[PDB]
Subunit: 121 residues, 2 copies
Protein backbone atom coordinates (compact mmCIF):
# COMPACT_ATOMS: atom_id res chain seq x y z
CA UNK A 1 0.00 0.00 0.00
CA UNK A 2 1.25 3.47 1.00
CA UNK A 3 5.03 3.91 0.74
CA UNK A 4 4.93 6.85 3.17
CA UNK A 5 2.57 9.15 5.05
CA UNK A 6 3.81 12.70 5.56
CA UNK A 7 1.88 14.93 7.92
CA UNK A 8 2.51 18.69 8.32
CA UNK A 9 1.73 20.94 11.31
CA UNK A 10 1.66 24.74 11.50
CA UNK A 11 2.86 26.47 14.65
CA UNK A 12 1.37 29.90 14.14
CA UNK A 13 2.60 32.61 16.53
CA UNK A 14 1.37 36.12 17.33
CA UNK A 15 2.94 37.71 20.41
CA UNK A 16 3.35 35.13 23.16
CA UNK A 17 0.33 33.23 21.77
CA UNK A 18 -0.02 30.20 19.50
CA UNK A 19 -3.03 29.17 17.40
CA UNK A 20 -4.38 25.96 18.99
CA UNK A 21 -7.39 24.15 17.55
CA UNK A 22 -9.95 21.79 19.10
CA UNK A 23 -11.62 19.72 16.38
CA UNK A 24 -12.09 16.16 21.98
CA UNK A 25 -8.41 17.09 22.27
CA UNK A 26 -6.31 20.09 21.20
CA UNK A 27 -4.04 20.06 18.15
CA UNK A 28 -2.03 22.27 15.80
CA UNK A 29 -3.59 22.93 12.42
CA UNK A 30 -2.24 21.02 9.43
CA UNK A 31 -2.88 17.83 7.47
CA UNK A 32 -1.47 15.30 5.05
CA UNK A 33 0.89 15.95 2.16
CA UNK A 34 -0.50 15.01 -1.28
CA UNK A 35 1.79 13.23 -3.77
CA UNK A 36 3.64 15.86 -5.83
CA UNK A 37 3.65 18.61 -3.18
CA UNK A 38 6.52 19.86 -1.06
CA UNK A 39 5.95 19.95 2.73
CA UNK A 40 5.64 23.78 2.80
CA UNK A 41 3.13 23.99 -0.06
CA UNK A 42 1.14 21.13 1.56
CA UNK A 43 0.96 23.15 4.77
CA UNK A 44 0.00 26.46 3.09
CA UNK A 45 -2.78 24.69 1.15
CA UNK A 46 -3.98 22.81 4.25
CA UNK A 47 -4.29 26.02 6.30
CA UNK A 48 -6.07 27.87 3.43
CA UNK A 49 -8.50 24.96 2.93
CA UNK A 50 -9.49 24.44 6.56
CA UNK A 51 -9.19 28.03 7.89
CA UNK A 52 -9.03 30.52 4.94
CA UNK A 53 -5.83 31.71 6.66
CA UNK A 54 -2.95 32.99 4.55
CA UNK A 55 0.38 32.09 6.16
CA UNK A 56 4.09 32.07 5.30
CA UNK A 57 5.87 28.86 6.26
CA UNK A 58 9.12 29.54 8.17
CA UNK A 59 11.72 27.31 9.84
CA UNK A 60 11.13 23.65 10.63
CA UNK A 61 10.78 23.12 14.37
CA UNK A 62 10.99 19.31 14.57
CA UNK A 63 10.41 16.05 12.69
CA UNK A 64 8.55 13.25 14.43
CA UNK A 65 9.66 9.89 13.08
CA UNK A 66 7.99 6.58 13.82
CA UNK A 67 9.08 2.94 13.75
CA UNK A 68 5.66 1.41 13.00
CA UNK A 69 6.13 -1.89 11.14
CA UNK A 70 3.31 -1.53 8.57
CA UNK A 71 3.43 2.14 7.57
CA UNK A 72 6.19 4.76 7.43
CA UNK A 73 4.72 7.86 9.05
CA UNK A 74 6.54 11.15 9.54
CA UNK A 75 5.27 14.44 10.98
CA UNK A 76 6.93 17.80 10.14
CA UNK A 77 6.26 20.87 12.29
CA UNK A 78 7.00 24.35 10.98
CA UNK A 79 7.07 27.73 12.64
CA UNK A 80 4.63 29.79 10.58
CA UNK A 81 4.06 33.53 10.30
CA UNK A 82 0.61 34.86 9.31
CA UNK A 83 0.20 37.15 6.31
CA UNK A 84 -3.58 37.59 6.36
CA UNK A 85 -5.55 38.87 9.32
CA UNK A 86 -8.56 36.68 8.74
CA UNK A 87 -9.30 33.09 9.70
CA UNK A 88 -12.47 31.11 9.34
CA UNK A 89 -13.87 28.46 11.61
CA UNK A 90 -16.00 26.11 9.45
CA UNK A 91 -18.38 25.04 12.12
CA UNK A 92 -17.74 23.44 15.52
CA UNK A 93 -13.94 23.68 15.18
CA UNK A 94 -12.93 26.07 17.99
CA UNK A 95 -9.58 27.89 17.97
CA UNK A 96 -7.68 29.68 20.72
CA UNK A 97 -4.63 31.87 20.98
CA UNK A 98 -2.74 30.50 23.97
CA UNK A 99 0.59 31.02 25.69
CA UNK A 100 2.79 28.01 26.59
CA UNK A 101 1.62 27.89 30.23
CA UNK A 102 -1.99 27.92 29.08
CA UNK A 103 -1.07 25.07 26.66
CA UNK A 104 0.39 22.84 29.40
CA UNK A 105 -2.91 22.37 31.29
CA UNK A 106 -4.60 21.03 28.15
CA UNK A 107 -5.49 17.63 26.68
CA UNK A 108 -3.34 17.53 23.53
CA UNK A 109 -3.48 14.96 20.73
CA UNK A 110 -0.62 12.44 20.92
CA UNK A 111 0.92 13.52 17.60
CA UNK A 112 1.13 17.14 18.82
CA UNK A 113 2.66 16.54 22.27
CA UNK A 114 6.28 16.70 20.98
CA UNK A 115 5.53 20.12 19.46
CA UNK A 116 3.99 21.38 22.77
CA UNK A 117 6.99 19.97 24.67
CA UNK A 118 9.38 21.73 22.22
CA UNK A 119 7.55 25.11 22.22
CA UNK A 120 8.39 25.18 25.97
CA UNK A 121 12.12 24.42 25.44
CA UNK B 1 -7.48 17.74 7.61
CA UNK B 2 -7.80 14.99 10.25
CA UNK B 3 -4.86 12.67 10.92
CA UNK B 4 -6.74 9.60 9.65
CA UNK B 5 -6.49 7.75 6.34
CA UNK B 6 -8.55 5.08 4.53
CA UNK B 7 -6.75 2.76 2.11
CA UNK B 8 -8.34 0.37 -0.42
CA UNK B 9 -6.72 -2.67 -2.07
CA UNK B 10 -7.94 -4.70 -5.06
CA UNK B 11 -7.58 -8.46 -5.13
CA UNK B 12 -8.08 -9.05 -8.83
CA UNK B 13 -8.83 -12.71 -9.58
CA UNK B 14 -8.77 -14.54 -12.91
CA UNK B 15 -9.39 -18.27 -12.58
CA UNK B 16 -7.31 -19.21 -9.55
CA UNK B 17 -4.63 -16.57 -10.21
CA UNK B 18 -4.42 -13.15 -8.54
CA UNK B 19 -2.80 -9.94 -9.77
CA UNK B 20 0.25 -9.09 -7.66
CA UNK B 21 2.09 -5.79 -8.32
CA UNK B 22 5.55 -4.37 -7.60
CA UNK B 23 5.41 -0.57 -7.70
CA UNK B 24 8.82 1.06 -8.04
CA UNK B 25 12.59 0.74 -8.50
CA UNK B 26 15.16 1.12 -5.71
CA UNK B 27 18.58 2.78 -6.07
CA UNK B 28 20.46 -0.50 -5.55
CA UNK B 29 20.97 -3.36 -7.99
CA UNK B 30 20.59 -5.83 -5.10
CA UNK B 31 17.36 -4.44 -3.58
CA UNK B 32 13.80 -4.19 -4.96
CA UNK B 33 10.29 -3.20 -3.94
CA UNK B 34 8.13 -5.87 -2.27
CA UNK B 35 4.87 -7.06 -3.78
CA UNK B 36 1.46 -5.61 -2.97
CA UNK B 37 -2.13 -5.45 -4.19
CA UNK B 38 -3.06 -2.51 -6.38
CA UNK B 39 -5.00 0.35 -4.78
CA UNK B 40 -4.51 3.62 -2.93
CA UNK B 41 -6.19 6.20 -0.68
CA UNK B 42 -9.89 6.92 -0.40
CA UNK B 43 -10.42 10.63 -1.13
CA UNK B 44 -13.23 12.61 0.53
CA UNK B 45 -16.75 12.20 -0.86
CA UNK B 46 -15.86 8.82 -2.41
CA UNK B 47 -17.19 5.42 -1.38
CA UNK B 48 -14.62 2.63 -0.83
CA UNK B 49 -15.55 0.82 -4.05
CA UNK B 50 -15.48 3.91 -6.30
CA UNK B 51 -12.10 4.97 -4.87
CA UNK B 52 -10.75 1.51 -5.69
CA UNK B 53 -12.16 1.52 -9.24
CA UNK B 54 -10.69 5.00 -9.85
CA UNK B 55 -7.26 4.06 -8.45
CA UNK B 56 -7.01 0.91 -10.60
CA UNK B 57 -8.03 2.94 -13.68
CA UNK B 58 -5.44 5.69 -13.03
CA UNK B 59 -2.40 3.48 -12.29
CA UNK B 60 -3.16 0.59 -14.68
CA UNK B 61 -5.80 1.74 -17.23
CA UNK B 62 -7.75 -1.25 -15.97
CA UNK B 63 -11.55 -1.43 -15.96
CA UNK B 64 -12.52 -3.44 -12.90
CA UNK B 65 -15.66 -4.48 -10.99
CA UNK B 66 -15.38 -4.16 -7.23
CA UNK B 67 -17.10 -7.10 -5.52
CA UNK B 68 -17.21 -8.33 -1.92
CA UNK B 69 -15.06 -7.05 0.94
CA UNK B 70 -12.49 -9.69 1.82
CA UNK B 71 -11.10 -8.04 4.96
CA UNK B 72 -10.53 -4.88 6.96
CA UNK B 73 -7.18 -4.17 8.63
CA UNK B 74 -7.24 -1.53 11.36
CA UNK B 75 -4.17 0.05 12.94
CA UNK B 76 -4.32 1.82 16.32
CA UNK B 77 -1.13 3.89 16.22
CA UNK B 78 -1.12 6.78 18.77
CA UNK B 79 -0.10 9.42 16.22
CA UNK B 80 -2.02 8.33 13.11
CA UNK B 81 -5.15 6.34 12.12
CA UNK B 82 -5.01 3.93 9.14
CA UNK B 83 -7.71 1.57 7.89
CA UNK B 84 -7.11 -0.85 5.00
CA UNK B 85 -10.03 -2.36 3.07
CA UNK B 86 -9.36 -5.29 0.71
CA UNK B 87 -12.04 -6.11 -1.89
CA UNK B 88 -12.27 -9.05 -4.30
CA UNK B 89 -12.33 -7.69 -7.85
CA UNK B 90 -13.18 -9.03 -11.29
CA UNK B 91 -11.76 -7.65 -14.55
CA UNK B 92 -14.16 -6.16 -17.11
CA UNK B 93 -11.47 -4.83 -19.46
CA UNK B 94 -8.98 -7.17 -21.11
CA UNK B 95 -5.90 -4.97 -21.08
CA UNK B 96 -3.84 -3.24 -18.41
CA UNK B 97 -0.87 -0.90 -18.83
CA UNK B 98 2.12 -0.91 -16.47
CA UNK B 99 4.07 2.39 -16.31
CA UNK B 100 7.82 2.87 -15.72
CA UNK B 101 9.31 0.63 -13.00
CA UNK B 102 6.04 -1.27 -12.36
CA UNK B 103 5.90 -5.09 -12.61
CA UNK B 104 2.87 -7.39 -12.26
CA UNK B 105 2.33 -11.16 -12.17
CA UNK B 106 -0.71 -13.43 -12.17
CA UNK B 107 -0.01 -15.90 -9.39
CA UNK B 108 -1.59 -18.82 -7.53
CA UNK B 109 -1.71 -18.69 -3.69
CA UNK B 110 1.14 -21.25 -3.64
CA UNK B 111 3.29 -19.10 -5.96
CA UNK B 112 2.32 -16.02 -3.90
CA UNK B 113 4.15 -17.67 -0.96
CA UNK B 114 7.40 -17.40 -2.97
CA UNK B 115 7.29 -13.56 -3.04
CA UNK B 116 8.20 -10.87 -0.53
CA UNK B 117 5.06 -8.97 0.39
CA UNK B 118 4.72 -5.44 1.83
CA UNK B 119 4.12 -5.70 5.60
CA UNK B 120 0.74 -3.96 5.28
CA UNK B 121 -0.42 -6.43 2.56
CA UNK B 122 0.56 -9.60 4.48
CA UNK B 123 -2.81 -9.94 6.31
CA UNK B 124 -4.51 -9.91 2.86
CA UNK B 125 -2.22 -12.65 1.50
CA UNK B 126 -2.88 -14.81 4.57
CA UNK B 127 -6.67 -14.40 4.09
CA UNK B 128 -6.47 -15.42 0.41
CA UNK B 129 -4.22 -18.37 1.30
CA UNK B 130 -6.37 -19.65 4.22
CA UNK B 131 -9.49 -20.08 2.04
CA UNK B 132 -8.13 -22.42 -0.65
CA UNK B 133 -4.78 -23.64 0.71
Amino acid sequence: SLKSIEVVAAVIRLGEKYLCVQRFRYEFPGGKVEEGESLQEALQREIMEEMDYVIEVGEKLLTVHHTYPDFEITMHAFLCHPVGQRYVLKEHIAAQWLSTREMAILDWAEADKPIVRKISE
